[PDB]
């Protein structure tokens, strides 16, 4: 509960989605503000329970100012068999970047520069841990009243190798969100690295520059059409790496098209901004700038400090996730993460 005689007081609901319900709250004894995420009926759906487990493990591993942090995870208050809803206490973030972009709030070039900086700073750290987010978009980038940006929602994250047991190994065109989905996922190019995230970053960057989505495709083919209208026809090497014959045949059926310069896509936009944008939005994963190299780009020189943009050591281990687990075994694993959270706090 959250009554006068409990640790937390609920203020108001700030988010309702597939993740559960996020509320603003205060620690009653101190007045300190936090977010509390309720994950209702957390063990009912296997897919959802697996997302919960991998987020708990990843967020416990990370300690970085541009990644959402777990402050507490509430222990069960009922017998083990009746425990059904998980409560996670996190940094309070009043808004997301989607809200900000698509509102009457100011979003000057300097806002874009500062938000992009923070996003990339978080990514350098996450990517050095061998974690790919795979669902970066403005609604997963949280922004607080101090103008601090933190990356959230690690339910779709994976490492540098995913298991053949799960459907997303083969059905890569369904990974995450259409408008931000990297060409390698759309086309099954069999090259799945941290570059996935840099594509999404490019889309987010463009979206901040114009305050409208860069590639808002209505379906699979239309999404590819919109991307090719700017990037041009993909190379013979990329076309040959397309997993599916129909997709490869469809791309070959279209007439040749050269790239449109980013200066034409975004008239009058900042030169250095467009320079960096062009380094992110490439068909070839290996052609894209890394998060680390992006932080060294002239566009971000204002905020860049190589003494204060850390990597993460040791790297994150996804071994736990490749295991074929039942509902009850996943529940046990989640309860163990809660126990371990508190056991580690007792031993510091
Ligand atoms: C998955 C997750 N786990 C923990 C958190 C988390 N979230 C917040 N704050 C939030 C959460 C949601 C909203 C919101 O829904 N705003 C309305 C507009 N929104 C526009 C984009 C489409 C969705 C609707 C605002 C602030 N603070 C701390 C946290 F740890 N999250 C977030 C990313 C939802």
Author numbering: 48 to 395
From the manuscript:
The conventional, so-called type I, kinase inhibitor-binding mode is demonstrated by structures of ERK5 co-crystallized with the aminopyrimidine-containing compounds 2 and 3, while a novel allosteric binding mode was observed for three triazole-containing compounds (compounds 4–6). Compounds 2 and 3, like compound 1, bind at the conventional ATP-binding site, while compounds 4, 5 and 6 bind at a novel allosteric binding site. The aminopyrimidine motif forms a hydrogen-bond network with the backbone of Met140 in the ERK5 hinge region. The amide substituent on the phenyl ring of compound 3 extends into the solvent-accessible channel (the so-called front pocket; FP) and the amide NH donates a hydrogen bond to the side-chain amide carbonyl O atom of Gln146. The terminal piperidine ring provides an additional ionic interaction with the likely deprotonated carboxylic acid of Asp143. The N-isopropyl group of compound 3 is positioned similarly to the benzene ring in the 6,7,6 ring systems of compounds 1 and 2. As observed for the complex of compound 1 with ERK5, compounds 2–5 bind to a ‘DFG-in’ conformation of ERK5 in which both the hydrophobic R-spine (residues Leu106, Ile117, His180 and Phe201 in ERK5) and C-spine (Val69, Ala82, Leu144, Leu188, Leu189, Val190, Ile251 and Met255) are intact. The most potent allosteric inhibitor, compound 5, has an IC50 of 2.3 µM in an assay of ERK5 kinase activity, compared with an IC50 of 42 nM for the conventional kinase inhibitor 3. Compounds 2, 3 and 5 were tested against a panel of 225 kinases representative of the kinome to assess the selectivity of these three different scaffolds. The kinase selectivity-profile data show that compound 5 is the most selective, while compound 3 is the most promiscuous, with the selectivity of compound 2 being intermediate.
